[PDB]
Design a protein around this ligand. Structure first.
Ligand code: SF4
Lengths: 45, 258, 157, 61, 202, 117, 231, 159
DNA sequence: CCCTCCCCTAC
């Protein structure tokens, strides 16, 4: 298939759903437990 | 002058006689400087390029960007064939000052004992400073006498060579948020650190001839090389002096306050 | 034949010199056959009237810049303009310096800038332990290594 | 012999080796060689001093 | 105001000359490399030549034009053929009062970006020019000045500024001003720099 | 709206000559990414005066992203899960420019933490 | 940010971003503050545009404006545009964290030890006339496995380490095995799980993004690394 | 007027003849003064012959041409190839303020320099020159003076 | 502002 046929197949059937933009999806929380504990071994003066 | 021993010879031969480029009565720096100036005069006939080169060299010597090896004299010392003690040359003073601490450090007949010149107070005859490379590289506050070196080892021969042309060389010598300065300091520090690491790698590769090792204790064995006949040693001690100093810039406040 | 002269044309007298006799007549007139380059300043700022004299010898050192070069004279007298210029409005001008050649840039880029008749030889070296860098003395320091080497090229048997 | 034959500056073993044979030899003080030759450990140091003097003896030829 | 305009105009002229020399095959395309720093932060990834002589030539030309700026109201890079000296292409850069002496550099670089994009879009449509004796030239149109008449006093130089003034006054010669095809482009409408663009073909 | 978007694209393509991305439409019209792709495709249609070079990218399976250059030999057309228009380029060399964007309300995914000032 | 893939159900599972070094490429032999500042402003634009959507953990590299030794300190609070002054105020560290060159991120309990990749790149600059009985991905994976086996991150101390790394307690001598061992700035990409004394360490070789711009997505529920190529 | 045009035409013709003599191989190099004089405040180097006889001959030719300038309408300098007697090239010059004529002659001489410095080199001892007074051809049009009432055209031929 | 003493280079 040509490039125009791919665009006609994909973009014409666009869903345009779930894109509220007012209540965006919150990213999953991943924490760094070594942020404040103590003694970073590789931190030199 | 440039010699052409045959018409087929394309590149000339720099044939010098008697001038400071063949006499061992000076320093290796003056030989290179004089040869470069003479080649610039013979090839381009340009007095502006020679002047720019000479001013650049004088500025480098005045600042302290020299190799510190090309400023080492070497004269044969006849330690017994001298008339008296006050007529002894510059090398004999160093030789006797070394003998007084170790009588076994007496040179052979017609030995080439090197020495350098440093700064002094009013007066301070040339014989009075006369530091050897060992004394100069271990001294805390010792800097080469840039005035004496430049003038009395560069200006007379160039004056002769260029007064045969009609120009005086002595007149050419008398003439929380911060991203710019902090980044410039970082560039300087990183350049110096990379140069130091390159010198250390070169010394570690050179020390492979004896140790046949590559891991630790090879850098330790190579760190004790005091070969005064190698240009990498003087650069190594200069890099060490630079890295062990300027602690005010290398802190938590490098003009960035954090 | 070749390039024609025109309908009505004349010819001037033949020049006195040719391609070969030119230098031979230039030397006989009191001039060097080839006038090599004297020491000169490429920068007219560095002139500073340096060639003044030395030991009663007057030297003439000049520059090749446009500021120091004298105009072409016609008849022994230099022809120069004395009156002030008359600038006219709405003029056009052209850069005189020639740009580099196409071929020069390409050439710069392509370069990408059965009988024994000799003497046997033996060598010896010594290592002695010293005491805090004292250049070991042959009266208080003893020998520890007598590494020796024999020249195998000239050694027979 | 080297002083009479070739005209160089220092006339030491390292300088002559570099100017005639194009070989750069490290140089250790008499105290460093003593500390290496008295090291009960660090076979590398003993090999170092041995090869040091062996090369000094081989370059004389 | 001569404070910051002298740097932005220099960058614009550098990118202009380099783009004209690149997209017209005046020099081999291998000697060009897309970059953003040529001793000045460029507004785009402009193909700048890396020849030692050509860089100095372009820099001296731009400095001369910027020195004469107060009287120059038009600057043209003429593309002349080499088999015969004839202007086949001419890219005019108008300087109508330039809003000169009588500012959020990002906006200046945005305007320069628009102008250079227009110039590139225009140059990409012209037919391919063969190498091997295609060359260029430089012509300016001044308001009121007379060049070449500063060497009538022997002008003993004292520093580099006076020598530069002399060699810049002496580097220009006089000149004079069918099926011409003029194509206007997008200029710079920023406050201090009001520049206009043009083009000529055939 | 297909009216403000067309005018904005025409302006940023012809008056202020610059390559326009679909994220620019996202930031200017405050719309989602899919709606921006739909508007870009709609502007790619009705293009009797075509004076630009469309930049088409397609997402294959196994999470691969490619920018189509030849537009004649698209590898593995069966594994394509999406294929949209990325930008409209008036010139030949794409080479866009990226500046500071204030994504105050045009975000579809926010990080779990909030900026503490 | 979820603009290209449009699968917000799966893109919202990428909790953090970890740049493992080599953010700017230059030569300190011939460089000034201008072009380095241009590259740093480009990087700062990227950071300011991506931070409102995802958290970033920046790590120094081998050719970045930082120390040439292996324990490289964080870059600086400077070297970034003034638009990022709100993230460097001290309280906003969970969204942006300039970190030391070696570091053990405790990502929800998954202790991952990350290195920019100078140790392996310094081991590979040697030619050992052994191991016969060549610069392949399996060879570098074996080198990383041996680094984990010997419990020494930097076997070539004179090349990677610097004077005074520590006193009487060296940090490169491993005192605890991590779960994931990351060595970045490698020519090829490859993963390998090794069993050392009843334990299991997953080694990951992250390739450069300049050439072969792949992005590794490492899961934390099963430790499965998948790649995302960008052309 | 007729005052400044005379002197400036003298200087222009002297530089013209000397350039045509030096940039070809009519007379050998190292026989000219290439680093001493300037022609019309132009940045290029102008060569002037060193032999006083040839300079005086050129000056007398220029004075004799200017003495009868009202009758001549073309002053050409032909390049004759020896042993063939065929004019290879023929540089031709066809026929009120001091500044205007100065700038016109400056531009004309600059055009002559730019045209001469891009020609193929010539082997030695094969060319004699001959000036003519008019009282397959490759043509090239050069810049001329149009301000003064003595408008001159400058063009060259080859082969 | 001339002397001796020292260095070492050139035929
Ligand atoms: S300094 Fe000279 S001698 Fe000492 S190690 Fe480095 S190279 Fe070998």
């Amino acid at each position: 298939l040509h490039m125009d046929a791919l665009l006609t197949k994909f973009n014409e059937d666009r869903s345009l759903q779930d894109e509220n933009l007012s209540q965006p999806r919150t990213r999953v929380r991943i924490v760094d437990d070594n942020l404040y504990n103590k003694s970073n071994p590789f931190q030199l003066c | 002058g440039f010699s052409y021993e045959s018409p087929s010879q394309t590149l000339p031969i720099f044939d010098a006689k008697g001038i400071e480029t063949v006499r061992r009565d000076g320093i290796p720096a003056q030989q290179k400087i004089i040869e470069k100036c003479i080649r610039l005069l013979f090839q381009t006939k340009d007095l502006s390029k020679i002047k720019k080169y000479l001013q650049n060299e004088f500025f480098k010597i005045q600042i302290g960007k020299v190799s510190a090896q090309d400023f080492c004299f070497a004269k044969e010392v006849k330690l017994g064939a001298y008339k008296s003690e006050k007529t002894a040359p510059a090398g004999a003073v160093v030789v006797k000052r070394r003998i007084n601490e170790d009588h076994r450090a007496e040179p052979q007949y017609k030995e080439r004992i090197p020495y350098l010149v440093v700064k002094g107070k009013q007066g301070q005859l040339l014989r009075e400073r006369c530091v050897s490379p060992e004394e100069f590289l271990e001294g805390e506050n010792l800097e080469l006498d840039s005035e004496y070196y430049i003038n009395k080892i560069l200006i007379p021969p160039l004056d002769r060579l260029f007064n045969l042309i009609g120009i005086n060389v002595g007149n050419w010598a008398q003439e929380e948020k911060r991203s710019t300065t902090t980044l410039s300091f970082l560039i300087k520090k990183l350049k110096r650190q990379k140069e130091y690491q390159t010198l250390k790698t070169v010394c570690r590769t050179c020390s492979y001839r004896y140790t046949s090792d590559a891991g630790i204790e090879n850098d330790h064995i190579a760190s004790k090389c005091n070969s005064y006949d190698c240009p990498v040693f003087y650069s190594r001690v200069k890099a060490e002096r630079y890295l062990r100093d300027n602690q005010s810039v290398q802190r938590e406040e490098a003009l960035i306050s954090l | 034949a070749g390039l024609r002269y025109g309908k009505r044309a004349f010819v001037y007298g033949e020049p006195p010199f040719g391609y070969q006799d030119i230098l031979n007549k230039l030397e006989d007139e009191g001039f060097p056959k080839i006038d090599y380059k004297d020491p000169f300043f490429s920068n007219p700022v560095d002139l500073e009237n340096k060639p003044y004299a030395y030991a009663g010898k007057r030297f003439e050192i000049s520059s090749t810049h446009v500021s120091t070069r004298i105009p072409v004279q016609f008849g022994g007298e230099t022809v120069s303009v004395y009156n002030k210029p008359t600038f006219d409005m709405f003029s056009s001008w052209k850069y005189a310096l020639k740009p580099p050649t196409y071929d020069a840039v390409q050439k710069w880029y392509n370069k990408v800038p059965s009988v024994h008749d000799s003497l046997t030889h033996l060598t010896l070296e010594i290592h002695a332990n010293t005491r805090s860098d004292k250049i070991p003395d042959p009266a208080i320091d003893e020998v520890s290594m007598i590494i020796w080497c024999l020249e195998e090229e000239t050694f027979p048997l | 012999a080297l002083r009479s034959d070739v005209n160089l500056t220092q006339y030491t073993i390292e300088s002559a080796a570099f100017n005639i044979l194009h070989k750069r030899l490290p140089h250790f003080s008499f105290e460093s060689l003593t500390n290496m030759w008295n090291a009960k450990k660090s076979t590398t140091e003993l090999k170092t001093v041995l090869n040091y003097w062996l090369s000094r003896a081989q370059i004389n030829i | 105001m001569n404070r910051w305009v002298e740097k932005w105009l220099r960058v614009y002229l550098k990118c202009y000359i380099n783009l004209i020399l690149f997209y017209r095959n005046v020099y081999p395309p291998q000697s060009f490399d897309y970059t953003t720093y040529q001793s000045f932060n460029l507004p785009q990834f402009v193909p700048i030549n890396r020849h030692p002589a050509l860089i100095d030539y372009i820099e001296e030309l731009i400095l001369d034009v910027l020195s004469k700026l107060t009287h120059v109201y038009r600057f043209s890079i003429c593309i002349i053929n080499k088999k015969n000296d004839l202007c086949i292409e001419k890219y005019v850069l108008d300087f109508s009062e330039l809003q000169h002496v009588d500012i959020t550099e990002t906006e200046v670089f945005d305007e320069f970006r628009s102008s250079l994009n227009s110039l590139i879009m225009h140059l990409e449509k012209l037919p391919k020019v063969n190498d091997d004796t295609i060359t260029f030239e430089a012509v300016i149109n001044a308001i009121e000045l007379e060049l070449g008449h500063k060497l009538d006093r022997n002008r003993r130089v004292d520093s580099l500024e006076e020598k530069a003034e002399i060699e810049r006054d002496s580097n220009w010669v006089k000149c004079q001003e069918p099926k011409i095809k003029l194509t206007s482009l997008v200029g710079s409408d920023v406050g201090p720099l009001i520049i206009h663009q043009f083009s000529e073909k055939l | 709206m297909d009216q403000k978007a067309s005018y904005f694209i025409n302006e940023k393509l012809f008056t202020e000559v610059k390559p326009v991305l679909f994220t620019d439409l996202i930031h200017h019209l405050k719309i989602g990414p899919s709606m921006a792709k739909k508007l870009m495709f709609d502007y790619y249609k009705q293009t009797t005066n075509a004076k630009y070079n469309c930049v088409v990218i397609c997402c294959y399976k196994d999470q691969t992203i490619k920018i189509i250059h030849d537009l004649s030999n698209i590898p593995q057309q069966d594994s394509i899960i999406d294929c949209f228009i990325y930008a409209f380029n008036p010139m030949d060399s794409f080479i866009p420019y990226y500046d500071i964007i204030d994504q105050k309300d045009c975000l579809t995914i926010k990080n779990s933490y909030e900026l503490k000032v | 940010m979820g603009r290209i893939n449009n699968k917000i159900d799966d893109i919202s599972l990428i909790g953090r971003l970890l740049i493992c070094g080599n953010s700017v490429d230059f030569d300190i032999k011939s460089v000034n503050k201008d072009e380095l500042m241009i590259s740093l402003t480009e990087f700062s634009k990227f950071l300011h545009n991506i931070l409102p959507s995802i958290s970033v953990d920046i790590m120094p590299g081998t050719n970045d404006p930082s120390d040439k030794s292996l324990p490289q300190q964080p870059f600086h609070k400077s070297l970034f545009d003034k638009s990022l002054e709100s993230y460097f105020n001290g309280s906003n560290k969970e969204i942006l964290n300039l970190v030391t060159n070696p570091y053990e991120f405790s990502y929800n309990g998954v202790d991952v030890l990350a290195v920019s990749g100078k140790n392996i790149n310094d081991i590979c600059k040697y030619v050992i006339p052994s191991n016969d009985n060549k610069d392949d991905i399996e060879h570098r994976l074996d080198l990383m496995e041996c680094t984990m086996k010997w419990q020494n991150i930097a076997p070539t101390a004179p090349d990677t380490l610097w004077c005074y790394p520590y006193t009487d307690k060296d940090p490169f001598v491993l005192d605890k095995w991590p779960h994931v061992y990351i060595v970045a700035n490698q020519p090829y990409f490859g993963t390998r799980v090794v069993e050392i004394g009843g334990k299991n360490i997953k080694i990951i070789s992250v390739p450069e993004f300049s050439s072969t711009g792949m992005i590794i997505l490492l899961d934390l529920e099963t430790l499965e690394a998948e790649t995302v190529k960008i052309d």
